[PDB]
């Protein structure tokens, strides 16, 4: 136990590190403590990335309340004094993550860290800005204890002769400004103006943050660019468990324009900041200024290390005012006309999509974009333009279909398949050929996407010309879903075969393939397979029912005979899927199942209890007014898990099942008298519990039981 942990920690410290941390977190949660602490201390002393990652992975999994907080606080302060490389950034995030766990000493630690960071506020200023930002993100409430000193400290640390230090201070200042605005404007404006009159990137960054905070209209466009069903559906029968800136705007715009015009070739940090500040000013302050901004962007468009920044700025200006870029869009199109054919290209597609949001320019620009390459940004931009502006849907579809057909003729092929299954197109030739990639290619990644797109490409589902092909391609999916070596490919195939394919999976030949999947080594596939046959059982009972009766006894055999907590938890979960999916068949089998589960609850492990209680929830819905003789002996078991709960276990399931077996049985007003504590404890759960899901469930239980008058409450004490 300790030897493997020590070996894994050393391997992670020296994708391997991420895999080791994930495995350690899973093993620690499933499950020694002294050995882990000694290994962490040795790793932290020696390397640094592995020790921080191991501590972060163990944070929030083992369950340290105060003991782990004290040990981590000393370690966090050790790496705070010295600004180590980018690897130490994870340690700062790990410290913030630990402080966000919600411990009693977290507030004291945050205040102590803030005071230490204030003194530091470039091996000290840069670390303090990152630490302050992490604390503010993790604990916004604790970051508001001392905000006046932070602003004064930031105003002096940002004036230091550094480039990367100002980036952290600007991010920290923006986070503090956002928190203040969510719940100082004059002080920020005065400080920026004083520094405006090395002092290029810092001044622009402060002004950019104020403009973004004052006006969020341009921020939405930037977020969208960076990223790139029905009200009448009947519920399922058995639901399973689930100001100052605006006044000083013209002066700021004039000062920014003068700086951009003057510092054209004198200053790359300033050039990047100028382009970023230009989109904010254009959106906030909307023709000499617009023409000057376009000219500056055009000059920097051809400049090195500035085309990407200029392309984003040009698109933002076009979105702000369509008339300003009505005639200036041709310059961007002409520049990108020969740039696409020549092939860095990620920003080219982003600029076109941003400027698009008139209908004739994209008619010919589609061809240059097609030859640019197959990238996720290009597909996202083209799809967004077609949905937002369907000027030529056929032209966009024809180009995408032509490129997809040529690509599939002979990792890049995987993206082409995803695009075909992404949105609707205008296809019987593709599905026949799509059934050849996974049968020949040995790559695991390509088969995972090939399986998903086949199901989504089967939309045409009374003529004997398309029934044969859909029944043919469905055969291959069943074969791959049961004859693939790694479980990852098999899992996605069975998930694709959703309720939509109910009418085609009832065939005799298709049923045999599903019957094999019931007895599989991995539980994730057995859990999915049993759910599918349960729905399919009501369609062809001549085949499924004879096999299910043997299976049903085996599930109940494991509950009693096998004295293993893991097996009993495993079988109970599968039982819930069968009843929640085929209620009619399980209805006559209430007595053998309920009695087995009741005896399980009175055994003289959190895993089993959380599953048997959920299963009883579905059993109380299938058998209406029949589960009447067990309610009296079931309230005692459930109520003890709520009232006088010695362990702070998961009470959401117990609360959910308590209100689920009273809305169907009809036991409503009587329980308030036999148990003169149920009303009191439910009210106490409102203040004590903070989870939104639990709170919305306690209200429902109160409504279902009744609204008895206060006098009867006094009689029942």
């Amino acid at each position: 136990s300790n030897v493997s942990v020590l070996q894994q920690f050393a391997s992670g410290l020296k994708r391997a590190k991420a895999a080791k941390e994930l495995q350690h977190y899973v093993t620690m949660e499933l499950r020694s403590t002294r050995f882990y602490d000694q290994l962490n201390h040795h790793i932290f002393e020696l390397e640094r990335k592995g020790g921080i990652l191991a501590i972060a992975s163990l944070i929030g999994v083992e369950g340290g309340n105060a003991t782990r907080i004290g040990r981590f606080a000393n370690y966090l302060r050790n790496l705070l004094p010295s600004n180590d490389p980018v690897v130490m950034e994870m340690a700062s995030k790990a410290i913030g993550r630990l402080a966000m766990a919600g411990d009693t000493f977290t507030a004291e630690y945050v205040e102590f860290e803030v005071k230490r960071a204030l003194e530091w506020l470039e091996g000290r200023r840069h670390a303090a800005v990152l630490v302050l930002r992490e604390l503010a993100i993790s604990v916004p409430t604790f970051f508001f204890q001392q905000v006046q000193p932070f602003f004064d400290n930031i105003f002096v640390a940002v004036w230091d002769p550094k480039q990367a230090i100002r980036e952290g201070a600007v991010a920290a200042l923006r986070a503090c400004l956002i928190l203040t605005t969510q719940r100082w404007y004059r002080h920020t404006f005065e400080e920026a103006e004083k520094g405006f009159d090395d002092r290029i990137h810092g001044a622009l960054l402060i002004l950019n943050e104020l403009v973004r905070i004052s006006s969020m209209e341009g921020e939405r466009l930037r977020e969208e660019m960076e990223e790139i069903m029905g009200f009448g559906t009947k519920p399922r029968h058995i639901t399973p468990f689930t100001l100052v800136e605006s006044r000083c705007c013209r002066d700021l715009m004039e000062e920014k324009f003068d700086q951009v015009c003057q510092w054209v070739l004198k200053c790359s940090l300033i050039q990047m900041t100028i382009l970023n500040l230009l989109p904010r000013l254009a959106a906030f302050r909307p023709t000499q200024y617009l023409q000057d901004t376009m000219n500056h962007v055009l000059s920097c468009v051809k400049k090195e290390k500035e085309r990407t920044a200029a392309f984003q700025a040009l698109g933002l200006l076009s979105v702000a005012v369509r008339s300003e870029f009505k005639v200036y869009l041709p310059r961007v199109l002409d520049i990108i006309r020969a740039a696409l054919p020549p092939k860095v290209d990620a920003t080219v597609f982003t600029c076109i999509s941003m400027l698009a949001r008139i209908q004739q320019d994209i008619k010919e620009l589609l061809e240059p974009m097609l030859a640019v390459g197959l990238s996720p940004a290009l597909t996202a931009v083209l799809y967004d333009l077609s949905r937002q502006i369907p000027q030529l849907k056929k032209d966009i579809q024809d180009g995408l279909l032509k490129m997809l057909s040529l690509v599939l003729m002979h990792g890049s092929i995987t993206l082409a398949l995803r695009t075909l299954g992404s949105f609707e197109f205008e296809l019987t030739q593709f599905v026949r050929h799509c059934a050849d990639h996974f049968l020949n290619s040995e790559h695991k990644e390509i088969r995972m996407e090939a399986a998903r797109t086949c199901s989504r490409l089967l939309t045409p589902s009374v003529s004997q010309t398309a029934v044969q092909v859909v029944a043919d391609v469905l055969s291959k999916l069943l074969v791959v879903g049961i004859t693939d070596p790694d479980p990852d490919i098999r899992y996605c195939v069975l998930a694709s075969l959703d309720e939509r394919f109910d009418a085609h999976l009832a065939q005799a030949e298709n049923l045999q393939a599903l019957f094999v999947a019931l007895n599989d080594q991995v539980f994730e596939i057995r859990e999915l397979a049993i759910c599918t046959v349960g729905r399919l059982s009501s369609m062809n009972p001549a085949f499924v029912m004879p096999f299910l009766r043997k299976m049903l006894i085996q599930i109940l055999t494991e509950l009693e005979h096998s004295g293993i907590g893991r097996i009993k938890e495993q079988s109970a979960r599968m039982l819930g899927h069968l009843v929640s999916n085929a209620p009619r068949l399980i209805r006559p089998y209430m007595e053998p199942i309920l009695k087995a589960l009741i005896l399980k609850l009175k055994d003289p492990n959190p895993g089993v209890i959380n599953n048997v209680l959920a299963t009883i929830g579905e059993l109380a819905q299938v058998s209406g007014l029949e589960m009447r003789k067990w309610v009296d002996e079931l309230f005692i078991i459930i109520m003890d898990m709520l009232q006088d709960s010695s362990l702070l276990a998961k009470r959401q399931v117990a609360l959910w099942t308590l209100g689920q077996l009273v809305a169907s049985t009809g036991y409503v007003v009587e329980p308030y008298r036999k148990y003169p504590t149920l009303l009191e404890v439910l009210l106490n759960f409102l203040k004590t519990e903070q989870n939104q899901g639990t709170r919305r469930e306690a209200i429902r239980v109160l409504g279902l039981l009744g609204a008895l008058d206060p006098y009867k409450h006094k009689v029942n004490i």
């Binding site: 369609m539 062809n540 001549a542 085949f543």
Partner: peptide, 29 residues
């Protein structure tokens, strides 16, 4: 022997088989 004929009998509380003999494992649609 026809779908139309079976509907008439169903109104008068008479049931009938709605599958042919070519497949010995009928499936209710």
């Amino acid at each position: 022997k026809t779908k139309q004929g079976c509907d008439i009998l169903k109104c008068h509380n008479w049931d009938a088989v709605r599958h042919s003999r070519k497949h010995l494992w009928p499936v209710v649609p």
